[PDB]
Ligand binder design. Sequence first.
Ligand SMILES: [Mn+2]
Ligand SMILES: [Mn+2]
Ligand SMILES: [Mn+2]
Ligand SMILES: [Mn+2]
Lengths: 307, 307
Amino acid sequence: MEKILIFGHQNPDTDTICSAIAYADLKNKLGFNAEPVRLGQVNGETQYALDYFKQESPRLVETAANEVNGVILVDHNERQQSIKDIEEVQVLEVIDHHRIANFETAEPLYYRAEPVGCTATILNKMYKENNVKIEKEIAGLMLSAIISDSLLFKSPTCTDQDVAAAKELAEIAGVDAEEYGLNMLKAGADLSKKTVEELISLDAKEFTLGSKKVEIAQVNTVDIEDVKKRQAELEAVISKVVAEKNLDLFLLVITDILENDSLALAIGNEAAKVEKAFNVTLENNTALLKGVVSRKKQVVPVLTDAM
Amino acid sequence: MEKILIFGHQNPDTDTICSAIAYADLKNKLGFNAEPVRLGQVNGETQYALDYFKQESPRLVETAANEVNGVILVDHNERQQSIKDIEEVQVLEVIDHHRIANFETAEPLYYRAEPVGCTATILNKMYKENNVKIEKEIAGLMLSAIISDSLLFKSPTCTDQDVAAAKELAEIAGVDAEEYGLNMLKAGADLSKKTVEELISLDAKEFTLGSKKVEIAQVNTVDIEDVKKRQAELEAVISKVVAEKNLDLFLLVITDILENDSLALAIGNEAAKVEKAFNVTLENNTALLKGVVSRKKQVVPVLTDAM
Ligand SMILES: [Mn+2]
Ligand SMILES: [Mn+2]
Ligand SMILES: [Mn+2]
Ligand SMILES: [Mn+2]
């Protein structure tokens, strides 16, 4: 069997990593010579899953032309998202779940995209279609990918198929879908292992709306509780920054990526402007901003018009 | 259910007509509201199949945006091949077997392309995958599509899957794959309903190689037998032409488009030049010219350097 390289997009998500490993397995079990490969660094989320299921991190690669003549794309299809020298190899097949664009083939191929929330959901169909038993080990990676892409079935893109697939895989992998999922999701930005001065600095941008000096920092977690439990220390560091930068307002936006609601911690003179722009009542400088997940589209415009 | 329109490319081939009808059936049996549609005239090959299995010719359409919001594409994906106002509707899904190009979607969709020789081969998988019984009537249309696209399994694109599918469908439809196939393929161009003087003129070009007056006519069939059985009448009309035009050689090249071999019927003084240039032995003025399919590239250059 000519050798094939299977891999997902750049800036690898858990789907791009796990699905590549998963399909490579399926392919090999069907008599081919395939190897899972990644095009970037494996993030914490992915890691937790790889480690939990004792799986080797797919080999890093910069180009494919030098190793093979044909490749298989998973979780993507647009050129920019693919390998660097993609123009120089033949896309044998694509297993994906996104729009189709900036993609084109000179020859026919096995393209299989479905309107589901995760590439793994599709593979799972393919395993059964080819009647190939799924190893406990990999089923977990697949289950991981689904959880990852569907934000634990809470994602707007999640589907009844994704959910039924996750359930099915979680049993085989001998785990509890939601239980394992939360842990994995958590290992994402692991804030529990970060300084209170670190959180207030990650995604922080300063503005000067209405002649007032302001700073809005955001932090994404799968449980606002993890970060609210440390409000004392947060207020401390925030108050410091407010002093050093002579800020009229410092708005920390603690977003729950699962429930799409984000808790706000406003410290400043214009801390009342957060109560106006979002129509809320700050009680301990903490008010739940419902439905707010983006500050560029939901926070900045509503506060600019509040002052 | 929102209404959907299912259709193939323009200048409709039997795959584009039958697969559109077939998949609309599958879709309806699964609870949707779909209608098979065509973008052009139904040719003779397709007709024979439609009539044989008592099936109505899918409705002619010029645009879709006015009727529906979503469409399903079968047997194609490149814009130019699709409907006129394709840009104005949403491609819900694509069941196809060609390269992907000049195609792009804003949203995700169900895209399913396989490296087989016919769109119907894929539908057949899909019927079983969804466990839906295939009505005798439509199985025939699917069988037709496969026969049409694979030139009775002789096509270079034909696959083991296409043949296995044709067999399976042929039984259900209660017919003999190759028996019905030939009749259908024949109804395409149809040489059995053409004058012997008509065949020798479809594609006849005269040359004057080496000071000698010559004429080479070509005829493409799916069974040289259909044309050889009428050799008596052929030689009669050829000999007449040879007399009226004072030809030193009239070479009729009867090409079998299935086997890519073409039988030669040479009548003239230089009738031995065909024996030299092709390295053969004329027996009854008929010798099999193996591998010869083009006269511009394979007959003319080898006969010019022979006389
Ligand atoms: Mn992805
Ligand atoms: Mn994905
Ligand atoms: Mn076609
Ligand atoms: Mn076709």
